[PDB]
């Protein structure tokens, strides 16, 4: 019933540094069209079982969608480190959810190089689990402060992906959706066929 059409086959995905979060509740989700979709590159699931996703009922399910480079798909997993696993989007140590990634080389790629996707490569400290940073303040590297002026020892903390059709498989864009489950005192609301 709930719309897994606004999350998976949507028009335009968001960048990794601003990952789109959608809350879903009061649903009966049919996961035979997801687990056995035969179209997804990675369908990893931690803390839960893909064969038992329809068994346990939860209060809320959060779907976080973004686009990352192909070789960085492995970084979306609990207890990972890397340029995108601590500065853009992190998963909690005790994570119970699923990570679903599929290649998007036929949509998010242009002959001149799509420049509308960004990732952050600088931060004063790592990210706490499930934290979104949008600030474009200039990162400080040296001891001499710089008041909003770029230069040596002062950089812009965002870069764009050089997506092109001729790129390799590892550098091709990949759409990643993370489904996380919340079960608190409020009665459980979402689970599939009984």
């Amino acid at each position: 019933l709930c719309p897994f059409g606004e999350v998976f086959n949507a028009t335009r995905f968001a960048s990794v540094y601003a990952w789109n979060r959608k809350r879903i509740s009061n649903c009966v989700a049919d996961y035979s069209v997801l687990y056995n979709s035969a179209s997804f590159s990675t369908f990893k699931c931690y803390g839960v079982s893909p064969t038992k996703l329809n068994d346990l009922c939860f209060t809320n399910v959060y779907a976080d969608s973004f686009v990352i480079r192909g070789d960085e798909v492995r970084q979306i997993a609990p207890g990972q480190t890397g340029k995108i696993a601590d500065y853009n989007y992190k998963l909690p140590d005790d994570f119970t959810g699923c990570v679903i990634a599929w290649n998007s080389n036929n949509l998010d790629s242009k002959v001149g190089g799509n420049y509308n996707y960004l990732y952050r490569l600088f931060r004063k400290s790592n990210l706490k689990p499930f934290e979104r940073d949008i600030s474009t303040e200039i990162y400080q590297a040296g001891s001499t402060p710089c008041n909003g002026v770029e230069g040596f020892n002062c950089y812009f903390p965002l870069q764009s992906y050089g997506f092109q059709p001729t790129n390799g498989v590892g550098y091709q864009p990949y759409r990643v959706v993370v489904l996380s489950f919340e079960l608190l005192h409020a009665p459980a609301t979402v689970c599939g066929p009984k």
Partner: antibody
Amino acid sequence: QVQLVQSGAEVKKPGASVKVSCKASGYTFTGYYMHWVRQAPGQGLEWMGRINPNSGGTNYAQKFQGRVTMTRDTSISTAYMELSRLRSDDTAVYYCARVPYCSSTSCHRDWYFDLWGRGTLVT
Amino acid sequence: DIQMTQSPLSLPVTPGEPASISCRSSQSLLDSDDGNTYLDWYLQKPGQSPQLLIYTLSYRASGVPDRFSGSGSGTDFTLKISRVEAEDVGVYYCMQRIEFPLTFGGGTKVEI
């Protein structure tokens, strides 16, 4: 075929303004800072300024501040440099150079001019 | 604002003999944080755009033939051509990249 295409020669009267375009071909435009360096006839190279394609923030020299405006267009991957209040001393060849954005953990050690355009003559 | 003064301002050379070009800076280009000296040697041929030869005071650029080398310390820097070839004629520029008014030297002309 990895190249930087520049605008043709421009003749401008004193007191007017000149716009020079540098278009990237064969590489990712947003992976490189774009610098503008001019060479007057009989003089050495002079550095004008730089633009970051990602943010649009620009750093100019003190001499050219208040006259030079640098803009970027990612849809066509072109950097434009516009100089206002032209004089007789601005008659020069303007080259656009590319600089690796960040190739290390310092992003300060890779900042060389690894590619130069063919230049545009402004009179 | 760092000003680079390049010594030979006219370096007549004969092929087969090494040639040395001196460049001097008002302020030391060594950075204590990373231990790197930021001086780049560029070559401009007649009618052609400048090309990169040396970066970070010790490294050769891609496509640079082995006959070139660069060294120096503090403020005194030297570009050395062990074997000068017929195509080394041009103008050589030393550029600093520590403060932002990126400044290129006066240039040294090497012609046969």
